[PDB]
């Protein structure tokens, strides 16, 4: 933080050789003992608290003042409920802190993390998850907050809400089914997630993203009405 | 008529003027008017006709007046907000007052007057309509209010008359007077059971909270106005049942009320049966989930205390002590003066002299409760009640310092930690005049009389440690709290009183012992605070 | 739609008073006490996350050190 390029803030420049930019591969370490030592599940739980909430405070200030690459920032936002007692009042100033540095980065974060609960998921409790039940509840609670958080100022911040849209939607479409093409796409369930961030676009880029939407569908997957296409016709019914 | 009231105009001395000058015609329409303008006073645009009731009975013409209720909106003249509800409010009672004032032991005490009034009260009183319900027992019941007073003046004449009387027709005239003096105080009294039967027994527990508050305030009134007719449990027990109610500006109006009596109290005798038959649940409002009740709740527990000084018990005491590390500091002050009007009341320089059993008392105190191990707050809860106990320094460094006194026992180890702590907190709220964290704003621009006792309390704890604490730094000199507890007054001193007092060798002793301490102690924040001293 | 507010309840219940006069156990509360040692005392002081996003990690005292790190806290 000291010897950053922010030691030349209307300062003198003399000081330009020791300016220092961290290397990825410090970035990733800083990242895995933070994932590792602070977010983890009498006068020692006061203690603990205090000072994981004090360590969790240097890396979110590193990442405010945009020393380490914004990205690292969805392995934070990916924890607000599960300790919204805990650190929620740090992640929260985090992201209102990281909206004003760059809307449109701050919103591939949080779609990158709303991602990575889904791969989450994917990695062991199995493809035929039950979709109505535990912790897919969990993640459209996160989502409706997470929209919530957006408001609409209007600053630009419809661009924001269309490219977390483009990415819910080219990841929803990323990797056919090996069944058969004639079943739906893989990771389609969550559009019924993208389907929160809905009502914060107005009508023209709804009908925008609704052709992009187009780019993937194919009219007979569109007339395809069956209970595993249940997430599509619901996307399309809040695009519409 | 009620526009005087619409525009705050009504008043006492000018209306009485224009009410005798209406008693100069006649009172016959003097009521006629009377009824009329009250009954508008409401809110509602109603009529009065010159036999609207006049025959049949006048209680009817409620529902005919109701119909005539011009309703805007849902706010009768005391209800409508702003200007038109405070002046209309301070207002009301001025023209009842002077009705009863002008009255003068006449009309309200012959015939035909008195009575007229208090039938259009009752039905007012009943009404389910929100005006009369409302702003009759504001004025109804105030009207009791008003008369407490004029029967209260008999009492004085007839006592004047009875030595008088103590010992023709002077003696038929003493007999004469005395008889009527007995007539108008027993109408006087019937005319008053009229409001409390009818106007006070249902409407003191109305529905609606404020009803209740004015019937709660009046009671109040009347207690302190009376303290022999209103002072009994057939009128001393309708507070005591309100105490539980679940609104808080009755309970506040309640604890308010009755705190009256106990001020300036005349150590009344059944005052204190109904102390000792409420006790329990005056002493359970200490912590009322409204902090708004709680601190008018502990100032009515000290004010017994000041007379009757055996109601309270032990734990009953033990649980307002508790109270004092508290968190909100309005009850946190009031917690902290009990303690002092209960425990903390009861040579000039030394371990001997005053202030000595004082302050050897509050260490024991934070020794036993163990609800906090610092002792910030306790000193906080007491800086503006115990305003020398926590202050005069020179005895809090004598009974360290000072040997133990033949015929006297000497402190313990732990005694003289916890003293060393209330040491440096008392300095710490001295020389920095705000309050600790928690409890006050955090920003304050201090008055001249505040920057004045910072500079005098400053410089006397310069002029006091400086020469101290050497030898303090030298004795308690071993123990780790003790010297990260005493190693902190350093930054609390004037340093500009070193230099232009001679005080110099004190500097080098402070600093050889500083040098002493660094070499001998390996803790983490014993070093920290060499450092910081530095 | 005279909005009288006229309601039939202008009174209560004797078994709503009595209920009241025993049942005094949901009016009273428990009680907030402030920080119980030092440590907890410092903790309230900069634990508040506007404290917590301008004070440095390992705690430098002199102001000389707190400025070169402080001034390096952009808008």
Redesign the interface.
């Known amino acids: 933080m000291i010897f950053s390029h922010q030691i030349m803030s209307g300062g003198r420049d003399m000081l330009e050789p020791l300016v220092y930019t961290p290397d990825s591969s410090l970035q990733s370490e800083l990242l895995s003992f933070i994932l590792d030592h602070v977010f983890i599940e009498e006068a020692s739980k006061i203690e603990a608290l205090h000072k994981r909430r004090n360590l969790l405070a240097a890396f979110c200030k590193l990442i405010v003042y945009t020393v380490v690459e914004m990205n690292t920032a969805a392995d934070i936002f990916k924890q607000y409920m599960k300790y919204y007692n805990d650190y929620g009042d740090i992640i929260k100033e985090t992201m209102s802190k990281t909206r004003q540095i760059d809307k449109i980065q701050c919103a591939k974060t949080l779609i990158l993390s709303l991602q990575q609960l889904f791969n989450e998921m994917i990695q062991e409790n199995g493809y035929n998850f039950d979709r109505s039940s535990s912790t897919f509840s969990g993640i459209k609670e996160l989502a409706r907050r997470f929209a919530l958080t957006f408001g609409l100022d209007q600053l630009k911040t419809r661009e924001a809400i269309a490219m977390l849209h483009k990415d819910g939607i080219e990841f929803a479409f990323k990797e056919p089914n090996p069944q058969g093409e004639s079943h739906p796409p893989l990771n389609l369930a969550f559009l019924d997630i993208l389907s929160e961030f809905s009502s914060k676009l107005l009508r023209q880029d709804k009908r925008t993203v609704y052709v992009y939407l187009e780019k993937f569908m194919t009219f007979q997957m569109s007339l395809r009405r069956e209970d595993v296409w249940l997430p599509l016709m619901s996307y399309r019914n809040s695009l519409l | 008529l009620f526009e005087v009231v619409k525009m705050g105009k009504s008043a006492m001395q000018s209306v009485v003027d224009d009410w005798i000058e209406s008693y100069k015609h006649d009172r016959d329409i003097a009521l006629l008017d009377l009824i009329n303008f009250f009954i508008q006073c409401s809110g509602c645009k109603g009529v009065v006709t010159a036999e609207m009731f006049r025959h049949m009975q006048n209680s009817e013409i409620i529902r005919k007046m109701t119909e005539e ?1 011009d ?1 805007d ?2 706010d009768y003249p005391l209800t409508m907000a702003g200007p038109q509800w405070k002046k209309f409010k301070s207002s009301f009672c001025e023209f009842i007052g002077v009705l009863v004032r002008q009255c003068q032991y006449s009309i309200i005490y012959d015939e035909y007057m008195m009575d007229t009034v208090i039938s259009l009260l009752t039905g007012l009183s009943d009404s ?3 005006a009369f ?1 409302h702003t009759s027992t504001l004025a109804a019941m105030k009207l009791m209010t008003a008369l407490v007073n004029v029967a209260l003046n008999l009492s004085i004449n007839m006592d004047n008359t009875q030595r008088q009387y103590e010992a023709n027709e002077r003696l038929e005239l003493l007999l004469q007077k005395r008889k009527e003096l007995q007539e108008n105080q027993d109408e006087i009294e019937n005319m008053m059971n009229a409001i409390f039967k009818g106007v006070f027994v ?1 409407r003191y ?4 909270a404020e009803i209740r508050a004015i019937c709660i305030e009046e009671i109040g009134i009347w207690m302190k106005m009376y303290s022999d007719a209103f002072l009994n449990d057939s009128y001393l027990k309708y507070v005591g ?1 309100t105490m ?3 609104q808080g500006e009755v309970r506040l109006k309640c604890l308010t009320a009755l705190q009256g009596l106990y001020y300036n109290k005349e150590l009344n005798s059944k005052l204190e049966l109904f102390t000792s038959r409420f006790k329990d ?1 005056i002493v ?2 200490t ?3 409204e902090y708004d009740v709680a601190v008018q709740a502990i100032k009515l527990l000290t004010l017994v205390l000041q007379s009757s000084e055996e109601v309270l018990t032990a734990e009953d005491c033990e649980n307002v002590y ?2 004092v ?4 500091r309005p009850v946190a002050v009031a917690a902290g003066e009990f303690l002092y009007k209960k425990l903390f009341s009861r040579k000039r320089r030394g371990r001997q002299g005053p202030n000595a059993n004082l302050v050897k008392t509050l260490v024991f105190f934070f020794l036993e409760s163990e ?4 002792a ?2 306790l000193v906080d809860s007491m800086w503006d009640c115990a305003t020398e106990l926590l202050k005069d320094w020179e005895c809090m460094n004598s009974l360290l310092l000072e040997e133990p006194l033949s015929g006297e026992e000497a402190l313990t180890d732990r005694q003289e930690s916890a003293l060393i702590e209330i040491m440096l907190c008392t300095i710490r709220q001295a020389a920095e005049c705000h309050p ?4 006050g704003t955090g920003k304050r621009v201090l008055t001249a009389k505040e920057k004045k006792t910072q500079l005098d309390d400053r410089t006397k704890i310069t002029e006091l440690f400086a020469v101290a604490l050497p030898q303090l730094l030298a004795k308690y000199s071993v123990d780790a709290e003790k010297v990260t507890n005493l190693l902190q007054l350093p930054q609390y001193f004037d340093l500009e009183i070193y230099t232009t007092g001679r005080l110099e060798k004190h500097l080098d002793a402070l600093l050889r012992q500083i040098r002493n301490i660094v070499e001998k102690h390996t803790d983490t924040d014993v070093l920290e605070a060499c ?2 001293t530095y | 739609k005279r909005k009288l507010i006229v309601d039939s309840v202008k009174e209560l219940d004797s078994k709503t008073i009595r209920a009241q006069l025993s049942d005094y156990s949901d009016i009273v509360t428990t009680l907030d006490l402030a920080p119980p040692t030092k440590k907890l005392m410092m903790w309230k002081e900069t634990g508040g996350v506007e404290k917590l996003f301008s004070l440095p990690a390992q705690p430098l005292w002199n102001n000389r050190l707190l400025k070169l790190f402080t001034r390096c806290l952009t808008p």
């Open positions: 209720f309703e909106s849902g389910q309509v929100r319900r249902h527990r109305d529905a609606i049942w539980h109610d679940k649940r359970s409002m912590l009322d989930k508790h109270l590390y508290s968190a909100h609800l906090h191990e610092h910030a707050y600790p964290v928690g409890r450092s910081k």
